[PDB]
From Swiss-Prot, chain D:
Function: PsaA and PsaB bind P700, the primary electron donor of photosystem I (PSI), as well as the electron acceptors A0, A1 and FX. PSI is a plastocyanin/cytochrome c6-ferredoxin oxidoreductase, converting photonic excitation into a charge separation, which transfers an electron from the donor P700 chlorophyll pair to the spectroscopically characterized acceptors A0, A1, FX, FA and FB in turn. Oxidized P700 is reduced on the lumenal side of the thylakoid membrane by plastocyanin or cytochrome c6.
Highest taxon listed in the record's lineage: Eukaryota
Protein name as catalogued: Photosystem I P700 chlorophyll a apoprotein A2
Subcellular localization(s) per the UniProt record: Plastid, Chloroplast thylakoid membrane
Quaternary structure annotation from Swiss-Prot or TrEMBL: The PsaA/B heterodimer binds the P700 chlorophyll special pair and subsequent electron acceptors. PSI consists of a core antenna complex that captures photons, and an electron transfer chain that converts photonic excitation into a charge separation. The eukaryotic PSI reaction center is composed of at least 11 subunits.
TM regions (residue ranges): 1-27, 49-71
Gene: psaB
Family statement drawn from the similarity comment of this UniProt entry: Belongs to the PsaA/PsaB family.
Organism: Thalassiosira pseudonana
Signal peptide per UniProt: none
UniProtKB/Swiss-Prot annotation, chain E:
EC number(s) from the headed UniProt entry: 1.97.1.12
Alphabetical keyword list: 4Fe-4S, Chloroplast, Electron transport, Iron, Iron-sulfur, Membrane, Metal-binding, Oxidoreductase, Photosynthesis, Photosystem I, Plastid, Repeat, Thylakoid, Transport
Transmembrane annotation, as ranges: none
Reactions catalysed: reduced [plastocyanin] + hnu + oxidized [2Fe-2S]-[ferredoxin] = oxidized [plastocyanin] + reduced [2Fe-2S]-[ferredoxin]
Provenance organism: Thalassiosira pseudonana
Function field: Apoprotein for the two 4Fe-4S centers FA and FB of photosystem I (PSI); essential for photochemical activity. FB is the terminal electron acceptor of PSI, donating electrons to ferredoxin. The C-terminus interacts with PsaA/B/D and helps assemble the protein into the PSI complex. Required for binding of PsaD and PsaE to PSI. PSI is a plastocyanin/cytochrome c6-ferredoxin oxidoreductase, converting photonic excitation into a charge separation, which transfers an electron from the donor P700 chlorophyll pair to the spectroscopically characterized acceptors A0, A1, FX, FA and FB in turn.
Gene3D superfamilies: 3.30.70.20
Subunit relationships: The eukaryotic PSI reaction center is composed of at least 11 subunits.
GO BP term, example: photosynthetic electron transport in photosystem I
Protein name in UniProt: Photosystem I iron-sulfur center
Cofactor descriptive note: Binds 2 [4Fe-4S] clusters. Cluster 2 is most probably the spectroscopically characterized electron acceptor FA and cluster 1 is most probably FB.
UniProtKB/Swiss-Prot annotation, chain F:
One Gene Ontology biological process: photosynthesis
PANTHER family: OUTER MEMBRANE PROTEIN, OMPA-RELATED, PHOTOSYSTEM I P700 CHLOROPHYLL A APOPROTEIN A1-RELATED
NCBIfam families, alphabetized: psaA (TIGR01335)
Protein name as catalogued: Photosystem I P700 chlorophyll a apoprotein A1
Binding site for [4Fe-4S] cluster: 566, 575
InterPro entries with a match to the protein in the record: PSI_PsaA, PSI_PsaA/B, PSI_PsaA/B_CS, PSI_PsaA/B_sf
UniProt binding sites for chlorophyll a: 676, 684
TM segment ranges: 64-87, 150-173, 189-213, 285-303, 340-363, 379-405, 427-449, 524-542, 582-603, 657-679, 717-737
Organism whose genome encodes this protein: Thalassiosira pseudonana (Marine diatom)
Gene encoding the protein: psaA
GO cellular component entries: chloroplast thylakoid membrane; photosystem I
Curated annotation (Swiss-Prot), chain H:
Protein keywords: Chloroplast, Membrane, Photosynthesis, Photosystem I, Plastid, Thylakoid, Transmembrane, Transmembrane helix
Listed name of the protein: Photosystem I reaction center subunit IX
Family that this chain belongs to: Belongs to the PsaJ family.
Native organism: Thalassiosira pseudonana
Gene3D superfamilies: Single helix bin
Keyword hit for Cytoplasm: no
Swiss-Prot/TrEMBL GO biological process terms: photosynthesis
Role according to the record: May help in the organization of the PsaE and PsaF subunits.
Length: 62, 160, 132, 74, 80, 743, 73, 40
C-alpha cells in the first residue's frame, strides 16, 4: 500500500523512472490531484530525484 | 590447394621476396663498415628477416601469386592456427574482463556511496574479483540457468 | 524625464514609427549609472524616468536590472503609430509571480502530458493533438 | 562505368526515402489501437533490442575492418 | 503565435513565470495542488519560443509545454 | 609608508594529499559528487577557471603566480631533455666537422617491431630520425663544440626546473603575496623592462663577444673543433682574443673613454649574410643585443615607484582625450589593474603577433649558421611559429570577451573609449561585413575568372603577367628603396638587411641560401587573399567581443554567460549566439588563413628561391618557376602543388620516411572523424545511449554514474579539436616529407 | 575483395541503424516522450533536459544521407 | 599515505598504470616471440 517509507514501482509511461522502484516519502490527504511524493536514487535528464504521483500510478513492491 | 593457392614453402614468389628484402638491407650495410654500430644492427636485422620467412615456410600457411601469406577461415581444422585457436584466446580473455567488470559493478552497487567507488576504485576488492574470472564460462552458465543473469521486463522502457 | 544618455547606433528604427513602439517608466531616489540593453551606459535621473525601446523583451530586461537597484515601480506601455497606448506590465498592478485573486486560468489541459490524443485519430481535422 | 555508378546512387536515394516515409507513417498514420499485438506493434515493443544489436554489429564490423586495414598499412 | 499549455501536474512553483523573458505567464488561484496556485498563459501573443519556462519546470515531464507555430514580428523577435 | 612594498602572508595553505583524493574540490557544485558522466567532463573543463572557483582577486592572483612557475618548470625540463638527447643520441660532433653533408639527427627508435626502419642513415656512422627544430645550428652559434658541454647544460636545466617547482609551492603554501603586492604595474614594468630584457640582452652580448664570436671565427676559418681552445681559455688570455680581434689589446680603456670606435673589430654594422655559413654575421648580432640592452635599461626608468621621479600611467592615460572621443582613456588603468582577463587579452594577442613576425624575419634574414641551406628546418620553423601565433591571437580575443561578460562594469566606464565603441557597434560591424565581401568577391573572383578563361581556351583574357596584369606597384617600390638604402639612407651600413629585397645570390654548398624575391601579378593576387582571410577572422571575433553582453536578438546575453549553448528554438533560432561560439567559428577561419600563408611560402620558395646554382651562373629552382603561371588558377594549386608535391608522402612506404605517410593518413582520418561531432546533435546520441543502456540493464548491470551524451558545447569543442589536429597534422607530414627530400 | 566487402557491410548496417532508430523513436523517446505531438520535423526541444538538438525523426534522414553517400562511394 | 593511496586509486591514474603494464607485456612478448601471424 502507498504509505510513508513504502517502496513502489512507477506506472506513468512518461516518467523517467517508469518500471522502476522508488520510496514514498509522504502522501497528502487534502484531495490534491497527485498526493504521493516518491523519491528516487537516480536523477532524471533534468537533474531531479523526486516527483509527485497519484496512487493508481504506483504499485507497491515487496 | 584450397582456392588454387600454393604452400609458401613451394612458392617461388615467396622466396624472391626474401632474397630481395635481404639484399636491400645488405646494400645499406655496405656503406657502413666492419663493426660499426650501424652495420652490426643491419646485420642483426637480416637474421630476423631470414628467420621470419623460414618460420612461415615451415608453417602450413598458403601463399598466393604475389608470394604473400593468405589465411584460411572456413572452419577447417587443418588451418586452425590461423583463426580458430587464436580466436579462443580472445574469447577467454574478453569474457574474463567483462565478467569481472560486471561483478565489481554489481558488488559496489550496494555500498554507502555506489558512485564514489566507480571513480575511485577499491583496489583490494577489485583485485579479488579480477582473479575470480578464470572460470567465467562456468559461472555464467550457472547464472543463466538460475535466472540471475537476464532480467524480466522490470526495466525502464520508452514511452511507445 | 529622459535619462542621461549620449546616443547610440543601437536605438529604434522605422518599425517603431510605422508598426509599433514600447516605453518603460520608473522612479528613482538617486542618480545612478545603469546599462541599457541597446548598448552603453546611462545615468538615471533623481525622480521620474522614461525610455523608449523597440521590443518588449528589451524593456523587461531593463526591469530586471532595475530590480537590482531596488526599483519596483516600473511600468511598460506599447504605443501604436496613431498614438494609442496599451498598458502591458504589471498588468493587474500585481507582478505575475504573485497569485492575485481575480485572475482566471487560460490554456489549461486537465490531464498529464501523456494523455493527449493520437495524431492519426485527428487526421483531416485541422486541429492538433495538443489543441484537441 | 557511368551506368553502374548512376543506378547505384539512385538506389541509395530510393532506399533512404523508403525508411523516411516509414517514419512519417509512424508519426502521422499509425493507429496504436487498430494494430494491437499486431506484427507491427510488437516491432515497436522490442525496439531497444533491435537498435542495440544493430549497434553491436556496426561496432564489430567497424573495429575489425579498420583494424585489419591499419595493420596491413603499418 | 506559439501555443503554451499547462497541465494538471503543475505544483505552483512559480518558477516558469519567473523565467519568461516576455511576461506571457501568470500565477492564478487553483485548488488542485497544495500550493493553491496554477500557471496560466494569458498573453501567448508575446511568446518568442525560448522554452526557458520548460527548462525551469520541476515536474517529471514538463507541466508547461510550448508548441512552436505561426510566426509574427513579435514571435520572431524582430526589433527592425 | 613606501608606495611600493612587499606584503606576503606566511603559511597560507597546508600541504596535504587529502584534496587530491577528493576530485572536484575546487568547485562547489562538482564537490557534491558524480551522478552522471557530465561531472567527469566538467571537472576537467573548470579546473583552471579560478574566477569561478573563488570570489577574491587575491586568491585568484595567488594561484596564477604559482601556476606560472609550474609552466616554467615544464619548459625547463623540455629544454633539458633536448640537450641531453643531443648529447647521448645525436650526431652533432660529426655534423660539426662536415655541416654540409651530415644530416641532423637527435632521436633514435628502439629496434622493436620493424620500427627500426625509421632510423635513417643520416650520416656520421649514425642512424636516427632527422630532426628539424634547428638545435644543431643554434649550438654551433653558441660555440658548443663538444658534447660534454651539452650534458652540463642539460643538468643545469633539470636543476632550474626543480627550483621553479619549489618556488611555486613556496609562494602558494608558505609565502603567498597579497593583492597589494600584485597591483604594482609601474614597478613590474620597470623591473621587467630593465632587468629581464635589458640585463638579459647585456649578459647575452657578453657571451657572444667573449665566447661565441671567437670560437665561430676559428670554426669558419677551418680549425678542427678539437683544436679550438676551450671557452675559458679565451676569457682568461686576452692575447688570444687580440689575435682574432685586434682591439682587445686596448682593453676596456677605450670604453670608459669615449672612443667606442676602436671596438669596430667585433661590433659592426655589416649587414647581409656570411658567405661561408649563410647566416648573419655574429659581430652584427653582438652589436644588436648591446644596443637593444641600452635602450631597454633606459626605458625601465620611466615609471614612478618610490622616489618621486617618473610617470604615473593613470595620469598619462587620462590626459589623452579628444574632441571625438569623450572622456578618452579614462578607466582603462583600473580595468587593467583589476582584471586578469583583460591583461591576458592584450598580452596574448601581442605574443601571437610577435611569433608571426619572427617567422617572416627569420627566413629573410637567416639568423643561424647553416640554417638557410637546410630547407627542412627553415620550412618547419616558419610554419611552426606561424601556427603558434594564430592560436594566441584568437585566444586574446576570447579572453577579451570573457572580460566584457564577467568584469565589465557600466559604472566605471561612462563615456570612455570602451563605452563609445559599444555604442556604435552596429556601424563597425556593418562596415567590416562589407569590407569582407568586397575583398572576398574581388580577390577570389580573380582566380575563378582565370580558371574559366583557361578552360574556355581564352588565355589572353586572364589576369596574368602575360595578359591583363595586376602588378604590386607599391611593394615593388618599397623593395627598391630598401635595396638602395645601404650607403644612402643608411650610410654606415655595408649591405642590404635582406637579400630578398635585392642583391646577389648567396650560395652555400652549391645550394641557394637567399636570392632576390620578385613580386608580380600572382603575388598581388595571393596577398589580397591573405587580407580577406584575416579580415573575416577579425569580423567574427570582434562581433563576439562587442555583442557579448547584449544584442537586439537576446537583450540579456550577459546573464546567460560567456559559454551558453543557445537561448532556445525561438526568435527563429538562437543557436550558437554566445561569445564562446564566435571564438569557435573564428578558429576555423584562422586555420584557413594560416594554411594559405604557409602554402604560399612553400610554393614561392621552392619555385623562385631555393635550388642549386652551378659554379657558373645557372640557377635551377626546385619546382622550376611554375608559381608565376600556375598559381593564378585553382587547378594549378591542385595539380602543380598538392598533387605534385605530395608524391613524397604517398611513396614513403618502405623507407625511413614511412612514418610521415602513416601520419598523413591518420590525420585525414581524424579530420573526417570530427565532422560527425560538428554536423550532428546531442539528441540523437542521447537516445541511442538509452537503447544501449537497456541492454546492460537486461543483463542486470548498469553504471550508477548514468551515461549521458556530451553537452552541446562540448560536442562543438571535440569537433573543432579533432578538425584542427587532423588538418594541421596532414600538412605537417606533407611538408616534412617533401622537405627531407628537397634538402 | 574480402576486406572491401566487409566495409560495404559496415555501411549498410550503420546507415540502417540511423534510419531504423529514427523510425522507431519517431513517436517518442525517454528524452521527449511526447515527440508524436510535434511532428516529423521540428527544430529541437530546447536547451534543457541536457540539450535536445537533432532529436526529430527528420534529423535521422539528415544524418543517414551522409552515410548513404559514403557507403555508395 | 592513506590519502595518497586514494589518489593513486583514482580512475585516471589506475587506467594509465594498467594500460602501461598491458602495453609493456605485449611489447615484451613481441620482443621475445616476434613476427607471428598464427600460432605457428
Ligand atoms: C568554400 C566554402 C565556403 C565559401 C565559399 C564560403 C563563403 C563565405 N563565407 Mg564561409 N564558411 C565555410 C565555408 C565557406 N564559406 C565553412 C566551412 C565555415 C565553417 C567555419 C564557414 C563559416 C563562415 C563564417 C562564420 C563567416 C563566413 C563568411 C563567409 C562570406 C565571406 C564574404 C565573402 O567573401 O563573400 C564573397 C563570397 C564568395 C563565395 C566569393 C566567390 C563568389 C564569386 C567568385 C564572386 C562573384 C559572384 C557574384 C557575387 C554573383 C555571381 C552571379 C552568378 C554566379 C549567379 C562568404 C559568403 C563570413 C561572412 O558572411 O561575412 C561576410 C563569416 O562571418 N563563413
Ligand atoms: C556460412 C558459412 C559457414 C559456416 C558458419 C561454417 C561453419 C563451420 N565449418 Mg565450414 N565451410 C564453409 C562455410 C561455413 N562453415 C564453406 C563455404 C566451406 C567450403 C570452402 C567450408 C568447409 C569446411 C571444412 C572443410 C570444415 C568446416 C568446418 C566447420 C565447423 C568448424 C568446426 C567446429 O566445431 O566449429 C563450423 C560449424 C569443419 C568441421 O565440420 O569440423 C567438424 C571442417 O572440417 N568447414
Ligand atoms: C515517388 C517518390 C516520392 C514521392 C511522391 C514523395 C513525396 C513526398 N515526400 Mg518524399 N522522398 C522521396 C521520394 C518521394 N517523396 C525520396 C526518394 C526521399 C529520400 C531523399 C524522400 C525524402 C523525404 C523527406 C525527408 C521528406 C519527404 C517529404 C515528402 C512530402 C512533401 C515533399 C515536399 O514538401 O517537397 C516540396 C518540394 C521540394 C522540397 C522541392 C525540392 C527541391 C530539392 C530539394 C532541391 C533540388 C536539387 C538541386 C536544386 C539541384 C541543383 C544542382 C545544380 C546546381 C547542378 C511528399 C508527400 C517531406 C514530408 O514531410 O512529407 C511528410 C519530408 O520531410 N520526402
Ligand atoms: C572518419 C569519419 C568517421 C568515423 C571513423 C566514424 C565512426 C563511427 N560512426 Mg560516424 N559519422 C561521421 C564520420 C565518422 N564516423 C560523419 C561525418 C557523420 C555525419 C553523418 C556520422 C554520423 C554517424 C551516426 C549517425 C552514427 C555514426 C556511428 C558511428 C560508429 C559506428 C560503429 C563503428 O564503426 O564502430 C567502430 C568504430 C570505429 C572503428 C571508430 C573508432 C576507432 C578508434 C580509433 C578505436 C580503434 C580501436 C582499435 C580497433 C584497437 C582497439 C584495441 C586497443 C584499445 C588496444 C563509429 C564510432 C553510429 C554509432 O553511434 O555507432 C553505433 C551512428 O549511429 N556516425
Ligand atoms: C621533453 C621531454 C622529453 C621527451 C619527450 C623525451 C622522449 C624520449 N626519451 Mg628522453 N629524456 C629527457 C626528456 C625527454 N625525453 C630528459 C630530461 C632526460 C634526462 C633524464 C632524458 C633521458 C633519456 C634517456 C636516458 C633515454 C631517453 C629516451 C627517450 C625516448 C624513449 C622514451 C621512453 O622512455 O619511452 C619509454 C617510456 C618509459 C620506459 C616510461 C614508462 C612509462 C611511465 C611508467 C608512464 C608514466 C606513469 C604515470 C605518470 C603515473 C602517474 C603517477 C602520478 C604520480 C603522476 C623518447 C623519444 C630513451 C631512448 O631514446 O632510448 C633510445 C633513453 O634511453 N631519454
Ligand atoms: C607534493 C607537494 C604538494 C602537495 C601535497 C600539495 C597539496 C595541495 N595543493 Mg599544491 N602545489 C605544489 C605542491 C604541492 N601541493 C607545487 C609545487 C605548486 C606549484 C606549481 C602548487 C600549486 C598549487 C596551487 C596553485 C593550488 C594548490 C592546491 C593544493 C591543494 C589541493 C590539491 C589539488 O588541487 O590537487 C591537484 C592534484 C593534481 C594531481 C594536479 C596535478 C596536475 C599536474 C601538475 C599537471 C601537469 C602534468 C603534466 C606535466 C601535464 C600534462 C602532460 C592541496 C592542499 C590548490 C588549493 O586547494 O589551494 C587552496 C591550488 O589552488 N597547489
Ligand atoms: C629584475 C627583476 C625581475 C626579473 C628578472 C623578473 C623576471 C620574471 N618575472 Mg617578475 N617581478 C619583478 C621583478 C622581476 N621579474 C617584480 C619586482 C615584481 C613585482 C612587481 C614581479 C612580478 C611578477 C609577476 C606577478 C609575474 C612575474 C613573472 C616573471 C617571469 C616572466 C616569464 C619570462 O619571461 O620567463 C623568462 C624565464 C627565465 C629568464 C628563467 C629564469 C628566471 C629566474 C627567476 C631569473 C632570476 C635571476 C637569475 C637567477 C639570474 C641571476 C644573475 C646571475 C647569474 C649573475 C620572469 C622570469 C611572471 C611569471 O611567470 O612568474 C613565475 C608573473 O606572472 N613577475
Ligand atoms: C596564455 C595562455 C592561456 C591561458 C593562461 C588561458 C587560461 C584560461 N582559459 Mg584560455 N585560451 C587560450 C590561451 C590561454 N587560456 C588560447 C590561445 C585560446 C584559443 C584556442 C583560448 C581559448 C579559451 C576558451 C574558448 C575558453 C578559455 C578558458 C580559459 C580559462 C579556463 C581554462 C580551462 O578550462 O582549463 C581546462 C583546460 C583544458 C581542458 C585544456 C586541456 C587541453 C585540451 C584537451 C586540448 C589538448 C590538445 C592537445 C595539445 C592535442 C594533443 C594531440 C595528441 C593527443 C595526439 C582560463 C582562465 C575557458 C573559460 O571558461 O574561461 C573563463 C573557455 O571557455 N580559453
Ligand atoms: C583614422 C583617423 C583617426 O585617427 O582619427 C582619430 C579620431 C580623432 O581622435 P581624437 O583626437 O579626437 O581623440 C584622442 C583620443 O582618442 C586619444 O588619442 O578619432 C575618431 O573619431 C576615429 C573614428 C573611426 C575611424 C574611421 C575609420
Ligand atoms: C532465390 C535464391 C536466393 C534468394 C534467397 C532469398 C529469399 C533472398 C532474400 C532476400 C531478402 C528477403 C531481402 C530483403 C530485403 C528487405 C528489405 C530491403 C526491407 C526493407 C524494409 C523497409 C524499407 C521498411 C520500411 C518501413 C518502415 C521503416 C516501417 C514500417 C513501414 C515501412 C514498411 C514503409 C539465393 C541467395 C540467391 C540463392 C538461391 C536461390
Ligand atoms: S517560451 Fe519563452 S516567452 Fe514563451 S512562455 Fe516560455 S519563457 Fe515565456
Ligand atoms: S515550473 Fe512547472 S510545476 Fe512549477 S509552476 Fe511552472 S508549470 Fe507548474
Ligand atoms: S537544443 Fe540545440 S536546437 Fe534546441 S534550443 Fe538548444 S541549441 Fe537550439
Amino acid at each position: 500500500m502507498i504509505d510513508r517509507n513504502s517502496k513502489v514501482r512507477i506506472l506513468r509511461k512518461e516518467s523517467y523512472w517508469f518500471n522502476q522502484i522508488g520510496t514514498v516519502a509522504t502522501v497528502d490527504q487534502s484531495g490534491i490531484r497527485y498526493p504521493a511524493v516518491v523519491r528516487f536514487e537516480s536523477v532524471n535528464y533534468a537533474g531531479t530525484n523526486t516527483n509527485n504521483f497519484a496512487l493508481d500510478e504506483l504499485v507497491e513492491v515487496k | 590447394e584450397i582456392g588454387g593457392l600454393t604452400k609458401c614453402s613451394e612458392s617461388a614468389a615467396f622466396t624472391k621476396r626474401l632474397n630481395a628484402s635481404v639484399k636491400k638491407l645488405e646494400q645499406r650495410a655496405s656503406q657502413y663498415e666492419a663493426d660499426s654500430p650501424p652495420a652490426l644492427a643491419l646485420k642483426q636485422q637480416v637474421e630476423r628477416t631470414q628467420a621470419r620467412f623460414d618460420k612461415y615456410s615451415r608453417s602450413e600457411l598458403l601463399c598466393g601469386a604475389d608470394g604473400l601469406p593468405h589465411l584460411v577461415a572456413d572452419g577447417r581444422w587443418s588451418h586452425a592456427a590461423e583463426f580458430i585457436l587464436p580466436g579462443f584466446g580472445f574469447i577467454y580473455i574478453s569474457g574474463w574482463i567483462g565478467w569481472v567488470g560486471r561483478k565489481y559493478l554489481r558488488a559496489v552497487s550496494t555500498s554507502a556511496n555506489p558512485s564514489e567507488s566507480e571513480i575511485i576504485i577499491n583496489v583490494p576488492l577489485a583485485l579479488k574479483i579480477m582473479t575470480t574470472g578464470y572460470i567465467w564460462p562456468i559461472s555464467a552458465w550457472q547464472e543463466l540457468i538460475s535466472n540471475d543473469l537476464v532480467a524480466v521486463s522490470e526495466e525502464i522502457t520508452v514511452s511507445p | 524625464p529622459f535619462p542621461t544618455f549620449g546616443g547610440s547606433t543601437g536605438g529604434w528604427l522605422r518599425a517603431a514609427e510605422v508598426e509599433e513602439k514600447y516605453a518603460i517608466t520608473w522612479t528613482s531616489t538617486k542618480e545612478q549609472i545603469f546599462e541599457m540593453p541597446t548598448g552603453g551606459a546611462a545615468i538615471m535621473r533623481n525622480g521620474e524616468n522614461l525610455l523608449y525601446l523597440a521590443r518588449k523583451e528589451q524593456c523587461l530586461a531593463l526591469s530586471t536590472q532595475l530590480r537590482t537597484f531596488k526599483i519596483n515601480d516600473y511600468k511598460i506601455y506599447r504605443i501604436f503609430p496613431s498614438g494609442e497606448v496599451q498598458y502591458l506590465h504589471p498588468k493587474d498592478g500585481v507582478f505575475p509571480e504573485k497569485v492575485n485573486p481575480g485572475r482566471t486560468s487560460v490554456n489549461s489541459r486537465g490531464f498529464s502530458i501523456g494523455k493527449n490524443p493520437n495524431p492519426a485519430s485527428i487526421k483531416f481535422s485541422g486541429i492538433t493533438t495538443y489543441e484537441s | 562505368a557511368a551506368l553502374y555508378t548512376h543506378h547505384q546512387y539512385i538506389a541509395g536515394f530510393l532506399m533512404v526515402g523508403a525508411f523516411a516515409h516509414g517514419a512519417i507513417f509512424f508519426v502521422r498514420d499509425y493507429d496504436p489501437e487498430l494494430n494491437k499485438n499486431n506484427v507491427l506493434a510488437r516491432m515497436l515493443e522490442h525496439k531497444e533490442a533491435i537498435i542495440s544489436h544493430l549497434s553491436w554489429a556496426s561496432l564489430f564490423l567497424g573495429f575489425h575492418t579498420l583494424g585489419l586495414y591499419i595493420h596491413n598499412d603499418t | 503565435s506559439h501555443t503554451v499549455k499547462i497541465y494538471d501536474t503543475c505544483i505552483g512553483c512559480t518558477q516558469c513565470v519567473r523565467a519568461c523573458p516576455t511576461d506571457v505567464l501568470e500565477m492564478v488561484p487553483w485548488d488542485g495542488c497544495k500550493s493553491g496556485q496554477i500557471a496560466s498563459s494569458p498573453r501567448v501573443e508575446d511568446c518568442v519560443g525560448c522554452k526557458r519556462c520548460e527548462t525551469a519546470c520541476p515536474t517529471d515531464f514538463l507541466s508547461v509545454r510550448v508548441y512552436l507555430g505561426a510566426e509574427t514580428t513579435r514571435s520572431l523577435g524582430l526589433a527592425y | 609608508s613606501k608606495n611600493v612594498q612587499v606584503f606576503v602572508e606566511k603559511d597560507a595553505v597546508e600541504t596535504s594529499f587529502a584534496k587530491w583524493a577528493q576530485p572536484g574540490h575546487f568547485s562547489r557544485t562538482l564537490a557534491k559528487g558524480p551522478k552522471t558522466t557530465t561531472w567527469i567532463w566538467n571537472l576537467h573543463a573548470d579546473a583552471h577557471d579560478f574566477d569561478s572557483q573563488t570570489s577574491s582577486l587575491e586568491e585568484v592572483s595567488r594561484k596564477i603566480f604559482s601556476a606560472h612557475f609550474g609552466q616554467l618548470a615544464i619548459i625547463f625540463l623540455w629544454i633539458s631533455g633536448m640537450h641531453f638527447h643531443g648529447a647521448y643520441f645525436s650526431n652533432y660532433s660529426a655534423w660539426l666537422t662536415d655541416p654540409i653533408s651530415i644530416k641532423q639527427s637527435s632521436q633514435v627508435v628502439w629496434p622493436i617491431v620493424g620500427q627500426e626502419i625509421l632510423n635513417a642513415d643520416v650520416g656520421g656512422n649514425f642512424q636516427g630520425i632527422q630532426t628539424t627544430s634547428g638545435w644543431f645550428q643554434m649550438w654551433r652559434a653558441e660555440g658548443i663544440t663538444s658534447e660534454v658541454e651539452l650534458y652540463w647544460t642539460a643538468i643545469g636545466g633539470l636543476a632550474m626546473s626543480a627550483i621553479m617547482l619549489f618556488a611555486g609551492w613556496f609562494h602558494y603554501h608558505k609565502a603567498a603575496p597579497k593583492l597589494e603586492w600584485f597591483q604594482n604595474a609601474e614597478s613590474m614594468m620597470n623591473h621587467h623592462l630593465a632587468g629581464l630584457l635589458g640585463l638579459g640582452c647585456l649578459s647575452w652580448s657578453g657571451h657572444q663577444i667573449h665566447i661565441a664570436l671567437p670560437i665561430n671565427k676559428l670554426l669558419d676559418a677551418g680549425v678542427s673543433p678539437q683544436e679550438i681552445p676551450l671557452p675559458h681559455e679565451f676569457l682568461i688570455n686576452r692575447d688570444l682574443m687580440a689575435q682574432l680581434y685586434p682591439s682587445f689589446s686596448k682593453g676596456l680603456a677605450p670604453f670608459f673613454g669615449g672612443n667606442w670606435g676602436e671596438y669596430s673589430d667585433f661590433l659592426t654594422f655589416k649587414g647581409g649574410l656570411n658567405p661561408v655559413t649563410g647566416g648573419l654575421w655574429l659581430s652584427d648580432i653582438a652589436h644588436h643585443h648591446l644596443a637593444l640592452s641600452v635602450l631597454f635599461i633606459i626605458a625601465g626608468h620611466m615609471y614612478r615607484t618610490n622616489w618621486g621621479i617618473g610617470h604615473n600611467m593613470k595620469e598619462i592615460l587620462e590626459a589623452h582625450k579628444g574632441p571625438f572621443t569623450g572622456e578618452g582613456h579614462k578607466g582603462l588603468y583600473e580595468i587593467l589593474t583589476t582584471s586578469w582577463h583583460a591583461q591576458l587579452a592584450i598580452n596574448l594577442a601581442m605574443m601571437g603577433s610577435l611569433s608571426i613576425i619572427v617567422a617572416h624575419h627569420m627566413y629573410a634574414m637567416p639568423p643561424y649558421p647553416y640554417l638557410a641551406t637546410d630547407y627542412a628546418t627553415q620550412l618547419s620553423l616558419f610554419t611552426h611559429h606561424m601556427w603558434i601565433g594564430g592560436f594566441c591571437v584568437v585566444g586574446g580575443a576570447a579572453h577579451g570577451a570573457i572580460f566584457m561578460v564577467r568584469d565589465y562594469t557600466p559604472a566605471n566606464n561612462y563615456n570612455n573609449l570602451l563605452d563609445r565603441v559599444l555604442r556604435h557597434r552596429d556601424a563597425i560591424i556593418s562596415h567590416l561585413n562589407w569590407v569582407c565581401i568586397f575583398l572576398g568577391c574581388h580577390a577570389f573572383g580573380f582566380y575563378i575568372h582565370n580558371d574559366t578563361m583557361r578552360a574556355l581556351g581564352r588565355p589572353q583574357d586572364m589576369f596574368s603577367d602575360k595578359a591583363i596584369q595586376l602588378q604590386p606597384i607599391f611593394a615593388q617600390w618599397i623593395q627598391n628603396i630598401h635595396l638602395l638604402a645601404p650607403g644612402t639612407t643608411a650610410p654606415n651600413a655595408l649591405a642590404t638587411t635582406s637579400y630578398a629585397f635585392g642583391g646577389d645570390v648567396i650560395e652555400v654548398g652549391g645550394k641557394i641560401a637567399m636570392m632576390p624575391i620578385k613580386l608580380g601579378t600572382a603575388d598581388f593576387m595571393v596577398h589580397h587573399i591573405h587580407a580577406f582571410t584575416i579580415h573575416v577572422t577579425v569580423l567574427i571575433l570582434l562581433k563576439g567581443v562587442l555583442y557579448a553582453r547584449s544584442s537586439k536578438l537576446i537583450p540579456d546575453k550577459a546573464n546567460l554567460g560567456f559559454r551558453f549553448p543557445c537561448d532556445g528554438p525561438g526568435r527563429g533560432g538562437t543557436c550558437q549566439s554566445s561569445s564562446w561560439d564566435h571564438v569557435f567559428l573564428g578558429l576555423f577561419w584562422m586555420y584557413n588563413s594560416i594554411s594559405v600563408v604557409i602554402f604560399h611560402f612553400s610554393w614561392k620558395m621552392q619555385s623562385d628561391v631555393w635550388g642549386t646554382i652551378t659554379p657558373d651562373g645557372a640557377i635551377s629552382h626546385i619546382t622550376g618557376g611554375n608559381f608565376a603561371q600556375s598559381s593564378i588558377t585553382i587547378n594549378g594549386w591542385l595539380r602543380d602543388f598538392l598533387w605534385s608535391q605530395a608524391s613524397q608522402v604517398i611513396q614513403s612506404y618502405g623507407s625511413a620516411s614511412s612514418a610521415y605517410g602513416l601520419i598523413f593518413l591518420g590525420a585525414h582520418f581524424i579530420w573526417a572523424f570530427s565532422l560527425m561531432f560538428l554536423f550532428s546533435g546531442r539528441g540523437y546520441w542521447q537516445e541511442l545511449i538509452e537503447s544501449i543502456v537497456w541492454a546492460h540493464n537486461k543483463l542486470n548491470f548498469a553504471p550508477t554514474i548514468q551515461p549521458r551524451a556530451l553537452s552541446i558545447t562540448q560536442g562543438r569543442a571535440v569537433g573543432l579539436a579533432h578538425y584542427l589536429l587532423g588538418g594541421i597534422g596532414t600538412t605537417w607530414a606533407f611538408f616534412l616529407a617533401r622537405a627531407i627530400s628537397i634538402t | 575483395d574480402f576486406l572491401v566487402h566487409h566495409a560495404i557491410a559496415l555501411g549498410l548496417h550503420v546507415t540502417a541503424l540511423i534510419l531504423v532508430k529514427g523510425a522507431l523513436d519517431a513517436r517518442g523517446s525517454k528524452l521527449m516522450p511526447d515527440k508524436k505531438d510535434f511532428g516529423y520535423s521540428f527544430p529541437c526541444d530546447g536547451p534543457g533536459r541536457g540539450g535536445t538538438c537533432d532529436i526529430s525523426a527528420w534529423d535521422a534522414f539528415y544524418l543517414a544521407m551522409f552515410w548513404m553517400l559514403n557507403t555508395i562511394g | 599515505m592513506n590519502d595518497f593511496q586514494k589518489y593513486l586509486s583514482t580512475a585516471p591514474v589506475l587506467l594509465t598504470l594498467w594500460m602501461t603494464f598491458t602495453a609493456g607485456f605485449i611489447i615484451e612478448v613481441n620482443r621475445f616471440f616476434p613476427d607471428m601471424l598464427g600460432l605457428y
